[PDB]
Amino acid sequence: ATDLGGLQERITTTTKGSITSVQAVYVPADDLTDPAPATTFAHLDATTVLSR
Amino acid sequence: EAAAPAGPKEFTEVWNKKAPSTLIVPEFPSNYTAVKAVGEGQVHGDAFPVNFYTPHSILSQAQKDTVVLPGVDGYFGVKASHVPTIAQLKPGVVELHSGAESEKFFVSGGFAFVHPNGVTDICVLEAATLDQVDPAAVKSALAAASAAQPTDEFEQAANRAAIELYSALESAVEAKA
Amino acid sequence: SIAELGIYPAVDPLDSTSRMLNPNVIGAEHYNVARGVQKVLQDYKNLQDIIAILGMDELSEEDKLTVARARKIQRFLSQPFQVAEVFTGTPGKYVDLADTISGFQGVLTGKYDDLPEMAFYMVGDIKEVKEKADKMAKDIASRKEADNKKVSEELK
Amino acid sequence: ILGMDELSEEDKLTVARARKIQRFLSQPFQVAEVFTGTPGKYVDLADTISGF
Amino acid sequence: SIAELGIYPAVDPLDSTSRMLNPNVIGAEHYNVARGVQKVLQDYKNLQDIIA
Amino acid sequence: SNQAVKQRIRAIKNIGKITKAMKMVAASKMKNAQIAVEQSRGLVDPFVRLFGDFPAVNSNKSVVVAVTSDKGLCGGLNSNITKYTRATLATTESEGKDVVVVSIGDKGRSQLTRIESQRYQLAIADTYKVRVTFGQASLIVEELIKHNPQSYQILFNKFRSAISFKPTVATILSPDLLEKQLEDVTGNSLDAYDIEASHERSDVLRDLTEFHLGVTLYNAMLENNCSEHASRMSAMENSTKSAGEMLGKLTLDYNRKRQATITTELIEIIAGASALM
Amino acid sequence: VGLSVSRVGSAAQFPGMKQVAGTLKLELAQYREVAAFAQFGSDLDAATQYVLERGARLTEMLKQKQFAPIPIERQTVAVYAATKGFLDKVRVQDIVAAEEAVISQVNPAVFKILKANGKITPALDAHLKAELRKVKLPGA
Amino acid sequence: VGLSVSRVGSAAQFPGMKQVAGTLKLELAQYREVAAFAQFGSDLDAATQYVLERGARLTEMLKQKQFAPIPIERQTVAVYAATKGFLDKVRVQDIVAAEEAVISQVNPAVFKILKANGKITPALDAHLKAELRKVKLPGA
Amino acid sequence: VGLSVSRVGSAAQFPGMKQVAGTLKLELAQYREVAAFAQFGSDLDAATQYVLERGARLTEMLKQKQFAPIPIERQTVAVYAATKGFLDKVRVQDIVAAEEAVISQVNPAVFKILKANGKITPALDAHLKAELRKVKLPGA
C-alpha cells in the first residue's frame, strides 16, 4: 500500500498544474478483493470499462 | 320445482361456510361470458350475432342476417328474430350469409342453438370448407362403406354414420359455383 | 447465520454437544425429545439447498411437514433473556426444564401444526406460544371505526 | 423469450430512446481519421449535456 | 468415484491414458472401440447434469 | 475442501444454465399453447348460456375432476387446486352424497390419495405428452359417463395472463336426472327452445351434456397445460435467479479460500526457511 | 438496519426519538421480513402489501442528503410524521419533498418545545398532531 | 458406509454374519444412490421405492445404543431378520424396538448353536426361519 | 475456443482463411452459449436449434487426427465447405468423412490458385461453389 501510495500520490493537482493518470488495471484471477486491485482501487477516481 | 336456487354467487356463500378463508372463492365459466340467453336485445333488425365454433378453432364471431343450417329434419334457415331452437345437425353444409357473398362450410355434425335473444350458436366438431375437400376420395370411401355389412351393432352404427357423411358430401361438392 | 435470522440465543443446535445428553443421565424422555429435535433440524438442513433453488413447492409432503416443523422448533429454541430486556424491551423468560421438554414434545408429535411460525418466536414456554397466536389473531381482527380521537378541544 | 412486439407501448419508447442513446455515445476519433477516412470531432461538455 | 459405484477395478476410463493408444500401434479396429467407449462415457458424464 | 467448493461452483453454474434453458423451453411452449387456448375458449360459451352454471347443486352422485400437470416442476399449481378440490369436496357433501375423484396428470394422483384415498377411483396421465386433442378429451369424458352421476365438477387453472392463473370450478349436470330438474323455475326454462332433434328432448339433452362434458374437459386441459408452462417459466426464473445468487456467494467464498491458501502456503515456507537461515 | 446495532444505544438517545423510533425499527423489521419472502411476487395479503407500502415510506423517510445534518428535534418530528400515518398516501417518490414540507410548514415552536423538554409531552403530541393535520403535503 | 473400508475385509469376518452381510452391503449400496431422489414421495416408482424402504430397514437396523455391545450371534440374527425380509411389515420408525422383539422372543438356543457351529448351518436356517415367525413385531 | 486467444491474429493469418474464419468465430461463439443450455434435444425453438445444428457441424469439422497436418489451402476449403452450405445434411457422424470427401473429390487445381493468390477471388469463389456440389458426400 505504500509502494502504490508512493506512486499514486505524486499524481495530483497542485497549484501549478495537474497530472491526470489513466492506468490500465489488471485484476488477477478475476478477484476484485485481491490485494493488488483492491489497493489500486483506493486511488481510482473513475473507471472506464472497455467491453467486447 | 325450484327448491334449490344454485348459481355462481350462491356458491360463494356456502363455500364461505366450510372452506378456509385463505383461499378465495374460485371462478366459474359463467364469469367469462358476456352474452347470456334470456336477456332482451342483440338482434337490432337485420343482423343477429352468429358464433360458428369448433373445438380447435373459431370460424366466425361476426353478425349475419341469415344462417342456413343442416338439421336432422333438413336444411333450415335462421332469420333474425327466429324461434329459440336447439337443433341437432347431420353432416351437411352450414351457409353463413351476410349479403351476396357466401361462406359455406361442410360440417361433420354437431348442434346449433338459436337463443331467446336471437343469437345463433353453431357448435360442430370438424368444419371442412368446401374448397378444400378432396373430390377424389368422396367416392372411393363410400364404396367400401356400402359393402361392409358386418355382424356387430357398433360398426352398424358406425357404417350408417359412415355413408351418411360421405353421401351428403357428394351432393355438396358437385353443384358448387 | 442463526443470529442473522433473529434467533436469540444464536445457539447452533446441530453443533452444540454435552456429555449430559445421555439417556442414563438426563432421563429417557428428555433424551428422546432432544434427539428428536436434532433429527428434524438435520433433515431440514439437508433440504436447504433444494429449497434454495427449487423452492418450497417441489418437496414431498413428508418433507414439507418437517420443513414446517423445523421452522417451528427453530423459532421455539429462541427466548427473551432477562439481561437483554434493556435493549429489546421484551421481558425475559426463565423456562423450566419440564416446560421445555413437554413444550418440545408437543411440536415433534404434531400437536401444534396449525399454529403460525411466528407464535413460537421469542416466547417462554408452550403456553405463551398459544397466547401469542391468540394475540397475533386478535391483532389482525382488531379494528375500530373512527378510532376514538377525543383529542381536539380538550377542556383546559 | 417472448418478442419485440410483446412489451408495452411506453416501453417501445424506451427501446427507441436507449438505442439512439447507444449510437449517440459513439464518436469518430481524430486519431482514427487516417485509416478510416472520416474526420474526428471534439464534443464539448456543454454540448453533450444538452444534446443528451 | 468408480469404487463408490462398486465397479472394480476402479479404473477411471476418462483419466487413464496410454502411449499405446496410437492406431499406428494397436490398429484402428482396437482404436475405435477404445475411442468410442471414451466418447459414449464422456457423453453420459455430460448428461448426468440433467438425468440426476 | 478448497476443491469441495470448486466442484460445488461448477454444479450450481450448470443448474443456472439448465434452468435457464428450461425457462426458454417453457416460454416457447407457452406462446404456442396460448394460440390453442383462445380457440378452445369459444365453444365453452354456448353451453354455459344454454345450461347456466350451477356449482352448488343437490347431487347424490358426483364426479369431481382435478386437472393437474404431468411433470412436477411447476411451482404451486398442482397443489393449489388440491387445496381447492378439498375445499369443494368439503362444500358439496353436507348431505351424504356419492363422490368419485378423478385426477388428470401424474401430479394429481400423487396428491389426491394424500387427502382423498377412498373416493379416488381413476387416474388419467400422460395427456400432455404429444398434444391435447378433442378426441382424447372425449374418451376421458366417456369414462366419466361410465359412472352415472347427477353432476360433474372440473377443477382447472384458467390462463388469464402469464401471471394470474385463477383456479376455476366448471360444472356439468346430468340431463334428465338433474339438468332438467334445476331448470324447473316457474315451469321450465328449457321449454322456450323448440327441439329440432330426431328423438325427444331427453335424448337430445343426453347428447348435449356429453358434448358439454367433452368441451369443458378439453378446455380444462388446455387452460391448465399453458398455465403449467407459464408457471414453469416463472418457477425457473426464480431458480436461475436463486442459483445465480448462490453461485455469487460461492465464488466470493472460494476467492477467500483461494487467497487464504496462498497466504498459508507462503507462511509455512517462510517459517521453514527462517528455521534454517 | 438488520445488522447495524448500538450496544449502549437506547440508554442514551433522545427521549422523543426513543418513543417514536421504537415503532420505526419494528415496522422496518417487517418490511425487511416481507420483502425477503415477497421477492417472487407470488401473492398478496393486502396487509403484507400494506407494510410493503408503509416500509417503503419509512425507508425514504430515513434517506438524507450529504453535508446537511438535521437537528434531533427536526428529526424526531419527521419520524413522528411518518410512523403516525400522517405521510400515508403520499407517493414514495415524494417523501423527500414531503417532509421537507413537514419540517418547513409546522410551527417552529414545536421544535423548540421538543428540544427543551426532550420528550413529546401529552400537551405536545396533542398539539403536534394538530400541526401535522395542517400540512400541505404534495399531491394529496 | 461408503467411505468406510476394511482391507482385511471378509477374510476375518464371522461366518453367518458373512452370509448375511452381502445382502446388507449390496442393498445399502443401492439405498445410497436412490437417495438424492428420495425428496419426492409423490414420485412413487415401486422399484426404487422397494429399495428406498428396504435399505431404510437396514439403516435403522444398524443403529445401536452405546455402552451396550451386542454378541456377534445376536447381531447376525438381526441382520438375517432384515435381509430375508422378516421385518418388511414393520414401519421404518419402529425397527429398533422390533430388533428387541426379534431378540427377546426367539428361543435363546438359536444363539447357543450359532456361536458353536460358527455359521448358519442348513439345519439352522430353517429352524430360525420359523423362529422369526413366532415372534410379534411392532408393526401392523 | 472460449479461452484460447491469439492477440496478434486480428489480420495476421491467411487471407483466404480470414474470409471464412471470421464467420466460424461467430457461428461457433453463438453455439457455445446454447450448447450447455440445450443439452436435451426435445423441445427446441426453430432459431436456437439451427445454431445447435450448425455449431455441431462446425465442431466436427475442426477436429483432426494426429501427425497429419493439413496445408492451409486445404483447410480453408473445408471451413468454406462448412461456413457456407454444402454440409448441412451430413449428420454429425459423417462430417469427419464428409470433409475428406471434399478434399478427395474437389478438383485439386483450386488448391493451386487458392494458395498462390492467398485469398478467395470471386472467379475462384464461383468455381468453389460448383466444385463443392459435384462431391459425393458419405451421408447416405
Domain residue spans in chain B?
37-133, 134-173
Q: What is the residue whose three cell numbers read 333438413? A: B74
CA distance B29 to B46: 30
- The answer to whether residues B122 and B88 touch, using CB atoms and an 8 Å cutoff, is no
The reply to whether F70 and F133 lie within a common domain is yes
Q: Which residues of F touch G41 (CB under 8 A)?
A: 163
Q: How many residues make up chain G in this entry?
A: 140
Interface of chain H against chain F, CB under 8 Å? 40, 42-44
- The answer to whether residues H106 and H136 touch, using CB atoms and an 8 Å cutoff, is no
The reply to whether F225 and F246 lie within a common domain is no
Q: What is the 3-state secondary structure (H, E, C) of chain B?
A: CCCCCCCCCHHHHHHHHHCCCCCCCCECHHHHCCCCCCCCCCCCCCCEEEEEECCCCEEECCEECEEEEEECCCEEEECCCCCCEEECECCEEEEEECCCCEEEEEECCCCEEECCCCCEEEECCCEEECCCCCCCCHHHHHHHHHHCCCCCHHHHHHHHHHHHHHHHHHCCCCCCC
**Domain count within chain F:** 2
CA distance F155 to F126: 18
Q: Which residues of E touch I40 (CB under 8 A)?
A: 50
Residue C130: how many other CB atoms lie within 10 Å: 14
F and B touch per CB criterion (3+ pairs under 8 A): yes
Q: Say how far residue H54 (Cα) sits from the centre of its chain.
A: 10
CB < 8 Å from C in window 228-247 of F: 235, 238-239, 242-243, 246
Domain of residue F272 covers 1-24+236-277
Q: Is A13 helix (H, G, I), strand (E, B) or coil?
A: strand
CA distance B53 to B57: 7
Residue G76: how many other CB atoms lie within 10 Å: 25
The residue in chain F having the minimum alpha-carbon distance to the alpha carbon of residue G39 is F238
Say if the Cβ atoms of F158 and B55 lie within 8 Å: no
Pairing of β B120-123 and β B112-114: antiparallel
CA distance G20 to G83: 8
- The answer to whether residues F62 and F52 touch, using CB atoms and an 8 Å cutoff, is no
Going by C-alpha positions, the residue among F88, F96, F54, F63 that lies closest to residue F184 is: F54
- G92: which strand partners? none
Q: Say how far residue I114 (Cα) sits from the centre of its chain.
A: 16
Is F158 near chain D, with CB under 8 Å? no
Q: What is the residue whose three cell numbers read 376455476? A: F168
Q: Is F170 helix (H, G, I), strand (E, B) or coil?
A: strand
Say if the Cβ atoms of C152 and G10 lie within 8 Å: no
User: What CATH number should be reported for the domain holding residue G46?
Assistant: 1.20.150.20
What are the C-alpha distances in Å from G96 to residues G37, G93, G105?
A: 27, 7, 14
| CA atoms within a 13 Å half-sphere pointing along the CA-CB vector of H83 | 21
Phi, psi of G22 (to 5 degrees): -70, -45
Q: Which residues of I touch F28 (CB under 8 A)?
A: 43, 45
Say if the Cβ atoms of H36 and E4 lie within 8 Å: no
CA distance E16 to B1: 85
- The answer to whether residues C80 and C91 touch, using CB atoms and an 8 Å cutoff, is yes
- The answer to whether residues F113 and F134 touch, using CB atoms and an 8 Å cutoff, is no
Q: Which residues of F touch E50 (CB under 8 A)?
A: 18
Phi, psi of E41 (to 5 degrees): -85, -30
Q: What is the residue whose three cell numbers read 400515518? A: G85
Going by C-alpha positions, the residue among E29, E1, E31 that lies closest to residue E15 is: E1
Asked if residue G122 has a cis previous peptide bond (ω within 30° of 0), the answer is no
CA distance F54 to B7: 5
Q: What is the residue whose three cell numbers read 505504500? A: A2
- The answer to whether residues F63 and F152 touch, using CB atoms and an 8 Å cutoff, is yes
* Cell, residue F269: 515456507
CB < 8 Å from B in window 114-153 of F: 134
- The answer to whether residues F80 and F51 touch, using CB atoms and an 8 Å cutoff, is no
Residue I90: how many other CB atoms lie within 10 Å: 22
* Residue C22 host element (H or E): none
Q: Is C76 helix (H, G, I), strand (E, B) or coil?
A: helix
For residue G66, give the amino acid letter.
Q
CA distance I91 to I41: 14
What are the C-alpha distances in Å from F264 to residues D22, I37, I91?
A: 47, 39, 53
Subunits with 3+ C-beta pairs closer than 8 A to C: F, G, H
Residue G13: how many other CB atoms lie within 10 Å: 15
Please confirm, yes or no, whether G7 is among the known catalytic residues: yes
User: Which of the following is catalytic: G7, G32, G54, G74?
Assistant: G7
| CA atoms within a 13 Å half-sphere pointing along the CA-CB vector of B78 | 36
Q: Which residues of C touch H42 (CB under 8 A)?
A: 60-61
* Cell, residue F202: 331427453
CA-based nearest distance F111→chain H, Å: 7
- B77: which strand partners? B68
- B60: which strand partners? B52
Is F31 near chain D, with CB under 8 Å? yes
Say if the Cβ atoms of I39 and F29 lie within 8 Å: no
Residues 6+ apart with CB under 8 A from C10: C2, C3
* Cell, residue I134: 459435384
Phi, psi of F124 (to 5 degrees): -100, 135
- G137: which strand partners? none
Q: How big is the CA angle at G39 (ends G34 and G41), to the nearest 5 degrees?
A: 100
Direct distance between the N- and C-terminal alpha carbons of chain G, in angstroms, rounded to an integer: 30
Pairing of β B66-70 and β F165-173: unpaired
What's the burial of C42, exposed, middle or buried (CB within 10 Å: 0-12/13-18/19+)?
middle
What are the C-alpha distances in Å from F204 to residues F48, F136, F207, G2, I102?
A: 16, 23, 5, 69, 70
**Annotation: binding site of C:** 8, 18-19, 22, 87
Is A13 near chain F, with CB under 8 Å? no
- B139: which strand partners? none
| Most G CBs within 10 Å, among F237, F238, F240, to test the G interface | F238
The reply to whether F138 and F273 lie within a common domain is no
Residue I91: how many other CB atoms lie within 10 Å: 12
Positions of E strands within chain F: 61-67, 98-104, 120-124, 151-159, 165-173
Asked if residue C9 has a cis previous peptide bond (ω within 30° of 0), the answer is yes
Domain of residue G131 covers 14-140
* Cell, residue F274: 527462517
Q: How many residues make up chain F in this entry?
A: 277
Say if the Cβ atoms of C61 and H42 lie within 8 Å: yes
For residue I37, give the amino acid letter.
F
- B64: which strand partners? B48
CA-based nearest distance G1→chain F, Å: 21
* Cell, residue D26: 459513439
What are the C-alpha distances in Å from H81 to residues H77, H98, H105, H139?
A: 6, 10, 13, 14
DSSP state of A18: B
Going by C-alpha positions, the residue among B54, H92, B1 that lies closest to residue F215 is: B54
Subunits with 3+ C-beta pairs closer than 8 A to I: E, F
| Most A CBs within 10 Å, among F259, F261, F262, to test the A interface | F259
Q: Which residues of E touch I39 (CB under 8 A)?
A: 46-47, 49-50
Alpha helices in E1-52 (DSSP H): 23-26, 28-51
Phi/psi-derived region of residue B44, left when phi > 0, alpha when psi is between -120 and 50, beta in every other case? left
- B27: which strand partners? F168
The reply to whether F135 and F149 lie within a common domain is yes
Q: Is F171 helix (H, G, I), strand (E, B) or coil?
A: strand
- The answer to whether residues F212 and F134 touch, using CB atoms and an 8 Å cutoff, is no
For residue F51, give the amino acid letter.
F
Say if the Cβ atoms of C87 and G129 lie within 8 Å: no
What are the C-alpha distances in Å from F79 to residues D23, F89, F140, F161, F177?
A: 50, 15, 22, 20, 33
What are the C-alpha distances in Å from H82 to residues H55, H75, H95, H98?
A: 9, 11, 10, 10
User: What CATH number should be reported for the domain holding residue F18?
Assistant: 1.10.287.80
CA distance C60 to C67: 10
**Annotation: binding site of E for ADP:** 8
CA distance G110 to G127: 8
Phi, psi of F169 (to 5 degrees): -105, 115
Phi/psi-derived region of residue B7, left when phi > 0, alpha when psi is between -120 and 50, beta in every other case? left
C and G touch per CB criterion (3+ pairs under 8 A): yes
The reply to whether F123 and F255 lie within a common domain is no
